[PDB]
Design a protein around this ligand. Structure first.
Ligand SMILES: CC(C)(COP(=O)(O)OP(=O)(O)OC[C@H]1O[C@@H](n2cnc3c(N)ncnc32)[C@H](O)[C@@H]1OP(=O)(O)O)[C@@H](O)C(=O)NCCC(=O)NCCS
Ligand SMILES: CC(C)(COP(=O)(O)OP(=O)(O)OC[C@H]1O[C@@H](n2cnc3c(N)ncnc32)[C@H](O)[C@@H]1OP(=O)(O)O)[C@@H](O)C(=O)NCCC(=O)NCCS
Ligand SMILES: CC(C)(COP(=O)(O)OP(=O)(O)OC[C@H]1O[C@@H](n2cnc3c(N)ncnc32)[C@H](O)[C@@H]1OP(=O)(O)O)[C@@H](O)C(=O)NCCC(=O)NCCS
Ligand SMILES: CC(=O)N[C@H]1[C@H](O)[C@H](O)[C@@H](OP(=O)(O)OP(=O)(O)OC[C@H]2O[C@@H](n3cnc4c(=O)[nH]c(N)nc43)[C@H](O)[C@@H]2O)O[C@@H]1C
Ligand SMILES: CC(=O)N[C@H]1[C@H](O)[C@H](O)[C@@H](OP(=O)(O)OP(=O)(O)OC[C@H]2O[C@@H](n3cnc4c(=O)[nH]c(N)nc43)[C@H](O)[C@@H]2O)O[C@@H]1C
Ligand SMILES: CC(=O)N[C@H]1[C@H](O)[C@H](O)[C@@H](OP(=O)(O)OP(=O)(O)OC[C@H]2O[C@@H](n3cnc4c(=O)[nH]c(N)nc43)[C@H](O)[C@@H]2O)O[C@@H]1C
Ligand SMILES: [Cl-]
Ligand SMILES: [Cl-]
Ligand SMILES: [Cl-]
Ligand SMILES: [Cl-]
Ligand SMILES: [Cl-]
Ligand SMILES: [Cl-]
Lengths: 207, 207, 207
């Protein structure tokens, strides 16, 4: 628990955390410490579990990222971090292309190779994973996850906590409900309700 | 209709125009005005419909981009713009990787995150949309459209006005006819004639 | 056979070589000569077939790249080049994003637009082709080939000489055997043994 002055605290110490750490460092940020439910990751010390958050705040650390893949859990831990007095930073790799008219929330991960086009809105705690494409006028709800190499054409809306697997695609104007999962490679050609799983080319709901 | 000296005139004021405007600005270009069939877009004034083109030319504007998604219409409006004395510029996002041996036409859109490899030829008025990949020795006909996150392997030929939906893929050496549509996610494994629709993995013509 | 002092020798003079040459030049390297079984490519002289390798070495050239698409042949020619006293360079386009914790072998091609994330290991003579994504903690065996716009999620292992076609996708934690082929667009959702062909969404072994 001895730490430097000023860096970012990470909740989570798994594979997703490794990628987030590297995005932060590529921007010139310092990663101070990890809290993990199993109480180092790429040279960052694991200092305890989430009970260590008050201690970290008291010692002057005030900036945090939630590096947890599970969308519902990430959302819950973001709220906890904010309650403890932390501000949620963004982890945006410098190679990502984020249009100047994009609206970004807080606690957002944007991985290497991403492109996000004009007038898209990205909710708090979203993940836009490696190589993903978000075209113009999209709306991404809080804590959703666009997996690696996924792509949204224009005017797509993605509900809170929805998850699109590696290489999923969505055609223009479609709306996907909250808590829905699109399997890897699924090609979504019609609106999806909340709380379903859809797979295939074209994607079809699986009961 | 009062405008600055020197910028680019845009035909079209929709979603595609927004993305094109941002590519142009990312390169340091100034966008002077829009003409739209409904007579501002990201701060660019809409000054009239296409009947305003002579007026614009007379006031010294001579550079133009056709930001219209529909391929046949785009092609027609490009010809009209040239007849009115405009030169068609290219709108190439600075993040796109365009090989030094690529041959580019005029009025071409190349969005963020694109890669185009050696000895590919890109016809006038083509769109190479966000994140798309064009491998070596490809031939893209005038006014075709490679949609977001689409990919052509080596030696692929795409006919005039053809359209490949989001995430379409084409294997090496295939030829796709003029006016053909490949649905989102379609994986083209054999030559396609002119004026067909093909969908699926592998892509199959739908009557 | 008169050449400059210091550049890279290329085995192979086909389409793949063109792309490799351009990656090398984008990095500031000089390409000295090609050896090809048919005894210029983008301005690089073809000086003979592989029997010219001793001659090249004797004249002071010591750096080489094997620009051959076929994985088994590439692997064989890499061994031959090393036996003749050449060091195998890497051909990594400057636009590729290679994480600082990635382990790279020798003779590796990494094309434009690629992203490779944390703690991935890339075997000698691998090809990571245009726009491909390799997420965290992946293991790519010697002489494998990830085709254009392909994507591996986290923790994927790819065997020696395996080949993933354009736009193939692999979900987290999957292992693909040596010498296996995944067709274009295939979405791999379960481990694959050695020496099979798998196609489709989801990918299925074809006898
Ligand atoms: C669709 C998915 C959620 C199913 O998970 P699951 O229900 O645990 O599925 P299983 O692995 O048991 O497979 C159940 C069945 O679905 C099929 N299937 C699995 N994934 C599929 C996919 N993406 N597309 C089409 N079919 C799929 C299987 O072939 C199997 O078929 P069967 O009943 O003929 O045996 C999952 O396979 C998937 O695609 N996850 C996305 C993961 C991802 O991309 N992560 C990236 C993290 S950044
Ligand atoms: C293929 C396509 C052209 C069909 O358009 P459409 O004929 O208006 O089709 P509909 O939405 O009425 O769907 C007709 C049928 O095709 C199926 N389908 C639609 N798109 C499909 C696709 N891409 N792949 C496979 N099947 C598809 C539907 O499930 C429906 O099946 P059904 O008869 O069982 O109900 C269109 O869905 C598409 O893929 N457009 C590409 C758009 C795009 O990517 N734009 C990017 C702009 S930059
Ligand atoms: C799968 C593959 C290896 C098959 O090659 P092949 O056996 O010579 O196949 P053919 O072209 O004769 O097609 C055999 C059959 O497979 C089907 N098919 C071919 N490729 C397919 C694919 N990728 N996915 C699904 N089906 C496919 C065909 O429609 C045909 O079906 P049929 O028996 O109904 O006529 C090949 O088509 C492929 O995908 N190659 C990947 C190439 C690539 O991406 N290169 C990039 C280089 S960097
Ligand atoms: C590209 C890709 O496939 N990325 C995947 C990755 O492959 C994994 O499937 C997954 O990454 P994640 O890093 O979340 O999972 P894992 O590697 O299993 O690590 C989860 C970490 O979270 C920790 N953890 C879980 N619950 C909590 C919790 O409540 N609090 C804290 N502080 N840590 C927690 C857990 O102990 C573990 O170290 O999700 C990502 C989206
Ligand atoms: C990534 C993506 O999905 N992009 C799509 C996008 O989502 C749309 O589906 C579509 O974009 P486009 O901008 O062409 O469409 P829309 O947003 O509908 O705007 C078309 C504009 O063109 C105008 N227009 C149509 N006909 C003409 C015409 O004849 N002349 C002029 N000057 N303008 C015209 C029309 O008034 C409108 O403002 O095409 C793109 C390829
Ligand atoms: C993006 C894409 O589709 N790339 C493909 C590309 O489209 C081709 O299908 C293929 O490229 P490659 O350049 O290997 O193939 P090709 O264009 O046919 O050229 C092979 C070259 O290797 C030469 N060659 C073959 N065997 C040998 C050999 O034994 N030694 C030497 N020195 N050269 C050899 C042959 O003479 C020819 O010039 O593989 C790539 C992965
Ligand atoms: Cl650090
Ligand atoms: Cl359905
Ligand atoms: Cl402007
Ligand atoms: Cl067919
Ligand atoms: Cl050179
Ligand atoms: Cl199978």
């Amino acid at each position: 628990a001895s730490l430097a002055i000023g860096g970012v605290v990470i909740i989570g110490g798994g594979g997703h955390a490794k990628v987030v750490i590297e995005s932060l460092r590529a921007c010139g940020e310092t990663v101070a410490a990890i809290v993990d439910a199993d109480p180092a990751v790429l040279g960052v010390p694991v200092v305890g579990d989430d009970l260590a958050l008050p201690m970290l705040r008291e010692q002057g650390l005030s900036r945090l990222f939630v590096a947890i893949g599970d969308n519902r859990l990430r959302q819950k831990l973001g709220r906890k971090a904010r309650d403890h007095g932390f501000s949620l930073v963004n982890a945006i790799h410098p190679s990502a292309v984020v249009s100047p008219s994009v609206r970004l929330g807080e606690g957002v991960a944007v991985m290497a190779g991403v492109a996000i086009n004009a007038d898209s809105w990205i909710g708090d705690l979203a993940i836009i994973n490696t190589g993903a494409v978000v075209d113009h006028d999209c709306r991404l709800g809080a804590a959703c996850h666009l997996g690696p190499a996924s792509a949204l054409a224009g005017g797509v809306s993605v509900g809170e906590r929805a998850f699109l697997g590696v290489g999923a695609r969505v055609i223009p104007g479609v709306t996907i409900g909250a808590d829905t999962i699109v399997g890897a490679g699924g090609v979504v050609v019609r609106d999806l309700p909340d709380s379903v799983l859809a797979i295939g080319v074209p994607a079809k709901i699986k009961g």
